[PDB]
Symmetry: C2
Subunit: 184 residues, 2 copies
């Protein structure tokens, strides 16, 4: 089955296509820019996005929003993870986190899927901590400073299959795949 994934993030592209790939699902990366609202929650942004790509994109379609939520920083950068990454970078988070007693954080991914006059949401969350220094050469964004719970390596020290086994995006994709086999 084919799914059109509206995104300009190539790191997301690969994670999604490869995972859903090995069950025979072809993921097709369309680049149609859509509006991401400011909101307290990722799902709010996804809802708005699907509603807007109504009848401008081939169906079935999916979109995704994700973020790193840092406990001692009251959820920052959260919904604005992409912006904060490109402005202040990995060094900015590490500077903010210097001397922190609490380095806990989570990644959250929310997938929106549209098919048959209807939208469905799936989500995934991985808990962890912010590393004391950047490590690793894979992945994208905050991957080099996030170590998920139970692991010693950062997200960026792992391969796509390895991240997908542990990551927020992997879990939302799982929840999504579970719904798909039950509804198609």
């Amino acid at each position: 089955m084919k799914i059109f994934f509206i995104t300009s993030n190539p790191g997301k592209v690969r994670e999604v296509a490869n995972f859903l790939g090995t069950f025979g699902i072809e993921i097709v990366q369309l680049k149609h820019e859509y509006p991401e609202i400011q909101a307290e929650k990722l799902e709010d942004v996804v809802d708005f996005g699907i509603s807007w790509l109504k009848g401008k994109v081939p169906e079935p379609f999916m979109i995704e929003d994700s973020g790193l939520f840092i406990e001692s920083l009251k959820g920052f950068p959260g919904v604005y993870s992409s912006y904060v990454y490109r402005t202040i970078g990995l060094e900015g988070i590490l500077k903010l986190m210097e001397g922190a007693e609490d380095r806990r954080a989570y990644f959250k991914s929310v997938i929106g899927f549209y098919i048959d006059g209807k939208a469905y949401k799936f989500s995934g969350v991985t808990w962890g901590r912010i590393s004391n220094e950047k490590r690793g050469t894979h992945g994208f964004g905050y991957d080099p400073i996030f170590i998920p719970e139970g692991s010693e390596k950062t997200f960026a020290e792992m391969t796509i299959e390895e991240k997908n086994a542990l990551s927020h995006r992997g879990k939302a994709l799982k929840a999504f795949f579970e719904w798909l086999k039950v509804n198609l």
Copy 2:
């Protein structure tokens, strides 16, 4: 199958017994006090607890820790939810949350299970927001000031079966039940 649940929380007792009940699992509430460490994470407390109830309690056994983590309060009261509830109460949280732009919070439950020279952990999380006033007559603890995402009612406006369908504890119990059918 019988499971010995070491706890003095009768609200937890009922939720757990009833849910696992309807699949023919008899949950037995033993009261053996054990030590809960201060820790950044619920799972840390559970691990320590199981390790300590080693060979003092009949097997198989389970224990649970849970907490309400309030975003704008940097995860408070979190691991210390039970203490904070009995000291400052529902009124204390509401006072702390007055004028808050961000009322987001989550409940997390972690179940520890011991059987066959081995411990296993399961967890569940429900996202939501702190209500502006207390509502409802069911449940325990912060139930009257927590509204889970997608709902209009607080945890305390719902029945046990209704909370179990939506709650953190219900989700950990589900994850636990899924593991049980696969391993017994």
